[PDB]
């Protein structure tokens, strides 16, 4: 590190913090100006390496920092002013803590002497967030900033990743002090609980158990082990079932990829689970959308949480797979593993129940098969929460992890467009495609102006139907088709609003499409055009 | 700052302690000891606490606590005349020879023995903070294992 | 199988620690019967008492370990243990009533803390079973106020 | 009340709640559908008296319920689904608790057996909101719903008003039970502290003075008192409208953005009647009358203070003064010296439109009678200083929170509460675009809302802290495209089929403002300004 | 199995104890302790005993005992609330130096000395089985000569 | 700020030493509230109690050092200290009064020195706060005579 100040020069706490971030490898931050963040914004302008991106709404900022953190694996950062700024972040933090995404939020606070007075824009943001974050700090001394920031980045990344927040009073940000970059972390309880490396005796017992009808069940815990899992699949030939979060961890085009399982999962994967004899629950939490046994996890709390496993191991699945890969390699010829009968029977089920879906009135599943075909299944895909999220998860062949970005457990609407911004900043040359329903879309439509400010090449695919589709389905399926206002057009008429004008307002080229035979060229026209584009796809409700 | 004692009566709804401890933590004050237990009637609990503060700030904090729906009443006791007691259990690693010495100190403090092993013994003590710290400071030469202090409990005396 | 379990938690100190600990039970809607804690030096030891199933306890006793600043957690309730409560009570005492209540305190090995012609303060300490016996005896006297610490506990060291 | 069910017919808890609301005089609710609110939405469709208004984003919903509650004085209501819905409300509740606005929020929750595990969309919303609401309840039994709802409406309205929240598990909403509309409130602490009527001995003791009034005066008695005294009145950004701005004694806003003469008045006053104020730092940088015993002596120690409703204190003092007006012979003709200050420092500002002129024109073209809502920007200070409010509640703005995006939905709330009023929304460039997506709702209801946009292509107020203090350094305060009005808000209006116009000239603006006022139904006016 | 306590009243005829102990020995149950002595009236004796059993088998055994001509009544006490006491004498081989150490333990247990020689001493103790075994386990380092334990005695408490 | 300070003075003996010491307070018109001394061997240690300002104390506590035969002088009043008073009282005691006053002495851990049918002598010792409590209790009995020593003090040895 190269310091802009002398090793003994007293400087503002703000610059101390900025340096602490640069020292941590920070490169871009999403922030919003306001009366409690000016000091930080000024310091961010004095810095040269960290780029600043200003969104239109703070709840767009946090969703961009999440898209960036999910696509790059790097810890995302976002900054906001106190009061109404801070409170708008809550919808983000509640998502990060549900998907185990590392993120660090920093906020400005009223002067220490004003805390508890109900001063102008004062808010107990620490007490509001205390129950929805992995940890949070109130900075009471500039001298702890280096240690606090370090501890924070460590906590965010170490163990099960999760969001963390640090609040800094304005006067402490202005206060001049001398840094100290050498200090120890005060994490005795947490450190003492950090998972030790896996024990080979269990790996060998697992190899022993490795059965007649085995199935591999993997989720978000496998994000950092795609190669080791592929190698293990070679040493075993076992069919792999993936969750809505596990997608991309295993190539969707592989013969053994059963795609998504569960309530919306493929019928053959669900049969596989229904008839399996050995379940390798590696990196999963037994979510009710899946559940309606061997467990390997880093989080000792998930062990036995939803269902009692027959065998369970605490520790990083990465090391467990490397160990088992060696144990299998030195004994593969002795084990002579074979499940051809089970694999064939399940393939027969694939043949009996393959994935399936009225003239020019477009099938959206065909719109997605075309989108896969024209993009080699290689693009970054992001999605809202309606019917459109399920279709984009089912009908696209992800070949790498992190290709799929979606709100898992929280299901926050308006996630799409800002998450596409995060992925676009993290992967400058990737194709980023954002797929949405018109209810999931409109909640964050104010962010389109940011794309024009950065000229990002984002491709937007609006699966328009003038309804809240997933809500309007459970009415028609169960609650006798009766309507809790699930229509979003003007009853007197036509697409409302005309999203073409919304693109026109930003000087962004766009098109509307209504008929099956045009669609394949329309998608290709969006993919071929340089820079940003919008395609509005009109569908029957 | 200086230490103060608060006595509070609360409407005993499940989760009410989280509401009350949130008020102190929002001012940042570090509660040094707390005890909570059933009061004189069914359906009320008493909370008692020690905090480092100013007698200005406690006056602001008791006004602040009256905004809660589930407090019945709140008192500072610090300037009043009040009786006070505190309970302590302590465990010590000790051998048969040192056991003599420890029993001597115990007898002086009027401490009652309450567990024995030839590995370790534990004593019960009741009194006030000065005898508490004095004892805990005097037993330092031996392997003091743990100390399960109650925090103070107090009542005003009308005399 | 509703039962009155007891958990003991050992921590490193921070402002708001009792508010994190009280949040995990408030999030369930579970009820804390009593809780006692005193900041020993750099560290503190809780003992807490709660009503519920041994099933849901395994959740809240696991979720307490997720906190970065908890050091150790145990369900102590099944183990062989030292266990004590301090109680303090003020009671009206007419000169005649002063005669029988003397016989009671002379029985329970209780001490008197201060005197006034209208009421007396008594200090009582022992096992919870003696505490309930005492309460059922005092029921026949005009109580004025009572306060109590909640049960402190420590495991007995078997060889 | 007329029940849709037999007095002994067991029915779903949802219908019990709906009836409890109708019994409380509920008329319109802002709600959003979703997997934990379907039961409530279906019951709201079975009901006939309560109208449902569906906004595009839940933060618009809570702001509409706040606009409605502020303009009508009635308790506002909003409903949302668990998880993401609920969390979006936090920005609203934090405002209500700062402006003492009564509001009741209701939300759906996961089944009781699922609480604590992190089930799908589960969120500790009770624990998240506990520190920012007056009280809140977790409904553990359908039988308490009548009592809970009653207690809630009472708490929201009684004492210092404030927001309250009730969370209901889905299975409890579906559960069938028999109601009981007769039950007592369990508020033994709060009730015992409710303020007793004012004591006349203090009123008589009260009998270069300056009257200082704020939001506590929202609820004629003050005008009458001004007759019995002739004392000049200074008003806060929240006190506006409580006293006619056109009266000779109305000194307008005081403080940091206040009028110079009002500030001089305070600087040289000899008796300060702090009635319904909390000594906010924008004002402060003494007689105190308040309902909130906590505000007494909070920021500054008063010489005399009284706890109780200012309404009763003024009625009592009005009688005490009336029976002795001739004996007291009050006179402060101080009034002249201050008028001299008015004369020495009166309020003031080519074709590049003054925003103050846009407000002066709009006042005079509307008799100062129209309902005004704002964002939070330079435009909030101008619309507070330059428009002559003649009733209370004509001014709707974020007082203490300063929450951007407040404008448009608060205009919706006011339009629903005052069907025939002239509702004009006066908005920042930054403040507008943050919630521009709600324009779709206006077309759904065809509300005649008038939108006036003080477009200067920047986050404006922050650029004043740049150009005053931070040496005019740009921290990205410019929101346009550096390569070249962006976005063209005319197209935004066009997307909703709403008529609009853009204006740049001082000479055109008076006709343009009148064109929006002439045009039936909704309209958008984009006022292009110098930054 | 688990231990149970039986209290029995009997006709006090010469040789009746042989009939009763025959019933236990005909089930094979090894009696852990037994104490028999005069009851509240002339012409009746009480027997009190402890046995390892099931609470099923004691119910069968008390039914079985009612077939005897000489029993008046039989009770299990095990599930009831009952007061319990036990007496022990113990003898120890000890020298003048160790005598110090032993007197210390005695004082802790509130044991009363009752015989002395410069060869050996004997202590008297009263209490309950846990203090009994604890003491007997702690005095192992010294030449413990004999123990004359009474077996328990119990009465239900109506409270 | 009238306060009831206390001074301790250590001397080498001479005939008339108390007369010099008592002259320095008499010269101001100050009041010695109590004074106690006893010649230990060749040297003696006074403790005295007086009423006034901390200002004028600095004069008389300086002027006491001018005496040639004072060894050491301290104001002890602010320091952590042991502190005690002996009191002795004779009270009328009718056989009935003999019954309640017995309950009192049995409370304060008082001793009886001698007996006559008309009156009794009681010895009382402790901290001054207990002394005032005792006096307020004896107020309800027909005192015959009382005498008291005035408070003795010594500093506690902190490590
Ligand atoms: C409308 C809707 C319907 C849905 N329906 C379905 C459906 O049919 N099928 C489906 O699959 N999903 C569905 N979901 C998603 C589902 O509900 C859960 O949100 C999802 O399963 C969460 O991801 P996860 O189970 O993989 O665990 P996550 O929530 O992503 O947690 C990560 C797991 O990885 C572990 N971990 C982290 N690091 C390591 C490590 N180093 N070593 C080992 N383990 C580690 C963690 O401890 C944890 O167990 C649906 C979502 C929506 C919005
Ligand atoms: C950028 C910015 C700058 C600002 N600058 C200024 C400025 O220069 N000047 C200015 O005046 N404002 C300014 N404000 C507003 C400021 O935040 C405060 O709202 C204001 O100073 C004080 O508000 P208040 O005391 O009138 O109302 P508040 O106290 O905030 O709210 C209502 C009051 O009514 C009382 N109350 C409610 N019901 C009753 C009842 N029944 N009986 C009695 N009392 C009751 C409550 O206790 C409460 O005190 C500014 C706002 C912004 C966004
Ligand atoms: C903030 C929030 N509100 C409501 C929901 C419930 N919800 C899930 S999907 C959905 C809307 C479905 O319509 P849309 O998003 O436009 O896509 P579509 O179903 O037509 O594909 C709703 C309201 C939610 N998850 N989050
Ligand atoms: C949610 C939030 N974010 C940021 C701020 C800080 N802030 C106060 S006013 C303002 C900009 C005002 O500009 P605009 O909305 O266009 O109104 P104008 O100043 O032009 O009148 C900002 C960024 C805030 N008050 N609230
Ligand atoms: C009194 C308090 C400890 C209460 N029983 C609670 O659970 O919050
Ligand atoms: C350890 C505990 C008492 C802590 N000092 C708190 O304030 O929460
Ligand atoms: C009671 C019993 C011991 C009896 N006296 C017997 O001799 O058998
Ligand atoms: C020391 C003192 C008592 C001395 N002997 C005197 O006569 O004054
Ligand atoms: Mg849709
Ligand atoms: Mg602006």
PDB file of N, CA and C in Angstrom, chain F residues 68-107:
ATOM      1  N   UNK F  68       5.613  21.177  69.749  1.00  0.00           N
ATOM      2  CA  UNK F  68       6.886  20.440  69.642  1.00  0.00           C
ATOM      3  C   UNK F  68       6.746  18.935  69.847  1.00  0.00           C
ATOM      4  N   UNK F  69       5.682  18.465  70.490  1.00  0.00           N
ATOM      5  CA  UNK F  69       5.556  17.071  70.918  1.00  0.00           C
ATOM      6  C   UNK F  69       4.459  16.281  70.175  1.00  0.00           C
ATOM      7  N   UNK F  70       3.835  16.859  69.146  1.00  0.00           N
ATOM      8  CA  UNK F  70       2.993  16.086  68.217  1.00  0.00           C
ATOM      9  C   UNK F  70       3.898  15.317  67.257  1.00  0.00           C
ATOM     10  N   UNK F  71       3.647  14.024  67.059  1.00  0.00           N
ATOM     11  CA  UNK F  71       4.421  13.200  66.135  1.00  0.00           C
ATOM     12  C   UNK F  71       3.842  13.295  64.731  1.00  0.00           C
ATOM     13  N   UNK F  72       2.551  13.000  64.572  1.00  0.00           N
ATOM     14  CA  UNK F  72       1.861  12.982  63.278  1.00  0.00           C
ATOM     15  C   UNK F  72       0.435  13.500  63.426  1.00  0.00           C
ATOM     16  N   UNK F  73      -0.102  14.088  62.364  1.00  0.00           N
ATOM     17  CA  UNK F  73      -1.492  14.553  62.291  1.00  0.00           C
ATOM     18  C   UNK F  73      -2.107  14.191  60.948  1.00  0.00           C
ATOM     19  N   UNK F  74      -3.339  13.697  60.933  1.00  0.00           N
ATOM     20  CA  UNK F  74      -4.107  13.484  59.708  1.00  0.00           C
ATOM     21  C   UNK F  74      -5.572  13.859  59.890  1.00  0.00           C
ATOM     22  N   UNK F  75      -6.158  14.416  58.836  1.00  0.00           N
ATOM     23  CA  UNK F  75      -7.592  14.320  58.595  1.00  0.00           C
ATOM     24  C   UNK F  75      -7.861  12.936  57.997  1.00  0.00           C
ATOM     25  N   UNK F  76      -8.593  12.100  58.721  1.00  0.00           N
ATOM     26  CA  UNK F  76      -8.899  10.727  58.313  1.00  0.00           C
ATOM     27  C   UNK F  76     -10.221  10.640  57.536  1.00  0.00           C
ATOM     28  N   UNK F  77     -11.036  11.695  57.533  1.00  0.00           N
ATOM     29  CA  UNK F  77     -12.476  11.630  57.237  1.00  0.00           C
ATOM     30  C   UNK F  77     -12.852  11.100  55.852  1.00  0.00           C
ATOM     31  N   UNK F  78     -12.043  11.357  54.827  1.00  0.00           N
ATOM     32  CA  UNK F  78     -12.325  10.959  53.441  1.00  0.00           C
ATOM     33  C   UNK F  78     -11.831   9.558  53.070  1.00  0.00           C
ATOM     34  N   UNK F  79     -10.940   8.964  53.860  1.00  0.00           N
ATOM     35  CA  UNK F  79     -10.220   7.737  53.494  1.00  0.00           C
ATOM     36  C   UNK F  79     -11.036   6.455  53.769  1.00  0.00           C
ATOM     37  N   UNK F  80     -10.728   5.312  53.134  1.00  0.00           N
ATOM     38  CA  UNK F  80     -11.352   4.037  53.484  1.00  0.00           C
ATOM     39  C   UNK F  80     -10.853   3.556  54.852  1.00  0.00           C
ATOM     40  N   UNK F  81     -11.759   3.344  55.807  1.00  0.00           N
ATOM     41  CA  UNK F  81     -11.381   3.177  57.211  1.00  0.00           C
ATOM     42  C   UNK F  81     -12.298   2.242  58.003  1.00  0.00           C
ATOM     43  N   UNK F  82     -11.695   1.545  58.959  1.00  0.00           N
ATOM     44  CA  UNK F  82     -12.382   0.881  60.063  1.00  0.00           C
ATOM     45  C   UNK F  82     -12.844   1.948  61.036  1.00  0.00           C
ATOM     46  N   UNK F  83     -14.024   1.783  61.614  1.00  0.00           N
ATOM     47  CA  UNK F  83     -14.643   2.789  62.470  1.00  0.00           C
ATOM     48  C   UNK F  83     -15.621   2.139  63.440  1.00  0.00           C
ATOM     49  N   UNK F  84     -15.522   2.431  64.736  1.00  0.00           N
ATOM     50  CA  UNK F  84     -16.315   1.763  65.778  1.00  0.00           C
ATOM     51  C   UNK F  84     -16.602   2.662  66.957  1.00  0.00           C
ATOM     52  N   UNK F  85     -17.698   2.404  67.643  1.00  0.00           N
ATOM     53  CA  UNK F  85     -18.042   3.047  68.896  1.00  0.00           C
ATOM     54  C   UNK F  85     -18.534   2.021  69.908  1.00  0.00           C
ATOM     55  N   UNK F  86     -18.136   2.185  71.165  1.00  0.00           N
ATOM     56  CA  UNK F  86     -18.687   1.481  72.319  1.00  0.00           C
ATOM     57  C   UNK F  86     -19.670   2.403  73.027  1.00  0.00           C
ATOM     58  N   UNK F  87     -20.829   1.870  73.377  1.00  0.00           N
ATOM     59  CA  UNK F  87     -21.874   2.526  74.143  1.00  0.00           C
ATOM     60  C   UNK F  87     -22.308   1.625  75.294  1.00  0.00           C
ATOM     61  N   UNK F  88     -22.710   2.221  76.405  1.00  0.00           N
ATOM     62  CA  UNK F  88     -23.155   1.498  77.578  1.00  0.00           C
ATOM     63  C   UNK F  88     -24.384   2.195  78.119  1.00  0.00           C
ATOM     64  N   UNK F  89     -25.421   1.436  78.459  1.00  0.00           N
ATOM     65  CA  UNK F  89     -26.688   2.046  78.836  1.00  0.00           C
ATOM     66  C   UNK F  89     -27.363   1.285  79.963  1.00  0.00           C
ATOM     67  N   UNK F  90     -27.997   2.030  80.861  1.00  0.00           N
ATOM     68  CA  UNK F  90     -28.776   1.476  81.955  1.00  0.00           C
ATOM     69  C   UNK F  90     -30.224   1.890  81.786  1.00  0.00           C
ATOM     70  N   UNK F  91     -31.136   0.925  81.826  1.00  0.00           N
ATOM     71  CA  UNK F  91     -32.528   1.202  81.507  1.00  0.00           C
ATOM     72  C   UNK F  91     -33.447   0.489  82.483  1.00  0.00           C
ATOM     73  N   UNK F  92     -34.552   1.146  82.822  1.00  0.00           N
ATOM     74  CA  UNK F  92     -35.546   0.544  83.695  1.00  0.00           C
ATOM     75  C   UNK F  92     -36.186  -0.632  82.979  1.00  0.00           C
ATOM     76  N   UNK F  93     -36.505  -1.695  83.715  1.00  0.00           N
ATOM     77  CA  UNK F  93     -36.962  -2.889  83.013  1.00  0.00           C
ATOM     78  C   UNK F  93     -37.989  -3.683  83.816  1.00  0.00           C
ATOM     79  N   UNK F  94     -39.242  -3.268  83.743  1.00  0.00           N
ATOM     80  CA  UNK F  94     -40.317  -4.002  84.387  1.00  0.00           C
ATOM     81  C   UNK F  94     -40.502  -5.367  83.732  1.00  0.00           C
ATOM     82  N   UNK F  95     -40.920  -6.378  84.500  1.00  0.00           N
ATOM     83  CA  UNK F  95     -40.864  -7.769  84.018  1.00  0.00           C
ATOM     84  C   UNK F  95     -41.448  -7.941  82.633  1.00  0.00           C
ATOM     85  N   UNK F  96     -42.495  -7.185  82.341  1.00  0.00           N
ATOM     86  CA  UNK F  96     -43.031  -7.199  80.994  1.00  0.00           C
ATOM     87  C   UNK F  96     -42.082  -6.489  80.052  1.00  0.00           C
ATOM     88  N   UNK F  97     -41.684  -5.271  80.405  1.00  0.00           N
ATOM     89  CA  UNK F  97     -40.722  -4.600  79.555  1.00  0.00           C
ATOM     90  C   UNK F  97     -39.514  -5.493  79.367  1.00  0.00           C
ATOM     91  N   UNK F  98     -39.178  -6.273  80.398  1.00  0.00           N
ATOM     92  CA  UNK F  98     -38.085  -7.228  80.300  1.00  0.00           C
ATOM     93  C   UNK F  98     -38.308  -8.201  79.161  1.00  0.00           C
ATOM     94  N   UNK F  99     -39.568  -8.426  78.804  1.00  0.00           N
ATOM     95  CA  UNK F  99     -39.845  -9.355  77.721  1.00  0.00           C
ATOM     96  C   UNK F  99     -39.540  -8.758  76.359  1.00  0.00           C
ATOM     97  N   UNK F 100     -39.993  -7.541  76.081  1.00  0.00           N
ATOM     98  CA  UNK F 100     -39.684  -7.038  74.746  1.00  0.00           C
ATOM     99  C   UNK F 100     -38.225  -6.640  74.614  1.00  0.00           C
ATOM    100  N   UNK F 101     -37.673  -5.971  75.623  1.00  0.00           N
ATOM    101  CA  UNK F 101     -36.293  -5.543  75.490  1.00  0.00           C
ATOM    102  C   UNK F 101     -35.396  -6.737  75.291  1.00  0.00           C
ATOM    103  N   UNK F 102     -35.792  -7.896  75.801  1.00  0.00           N
ATOM    104  CA  UNK F 102     -35.009  -9.065  75.475  1.00  0.00           C
ATOM    105  C   UNK F 102     -34.992  -9.298  73.977  1.00  0.00           C
ATOM    106  N   UNK F 103     -36.124  -9.096  73.312  1.00  0.00           N
ATOM    107  CA  UNK F 103     -36.147  -9.294  71.870  1.00  0.00           C
ATOM    108  C   UNK F 103     -35.220  -8.324  71.160  1.00  0.00           C
ATOM    109  N   UNK F 104     -35.053  -7.141  71.722  1.00  0.00           N
ATOM    110  CA  UNK F 104     -34.192  -6.151  71.089  1.00  0.00           C
ATOM    111  C   UNK F 104     -32.732  -6.536  71.237  1.00  0.00           C
ATOM    112  N   UNK F 105     -32.312  -6.835  72.458  1.00  0.00           N
ATOM    113  CA  UNK F 105     -30.919  -7.196  72.654  1.00  0.00           C
ATOM    114  C   UNK F 105     -30.615  -8.458  71.878  1.00  0.00           C
ATOM    115  N   UNK F 106     -31.576  -9.371  71.811  1.00  0.00           N
ATOM    116  CA  UNK F 106     -31.374 -10.560  71.011  1.00  0.00           C
ATOM    117  C   UNK F 106     -31.270 -10.227  69.537  1.00  0.00           C
ATOM    118  N   UNK F 107     -31.601  -9.002  69.161  1.00  0.00           N
ATOM    119  CA  UNK F 107     -31.454  -8.611  67.770  1.00  0.00           C
ATOM    120  C   UNK F 107     -30.107  -7.969  67.513  1.00  0.00           C
TER     121      UNK F 107
END
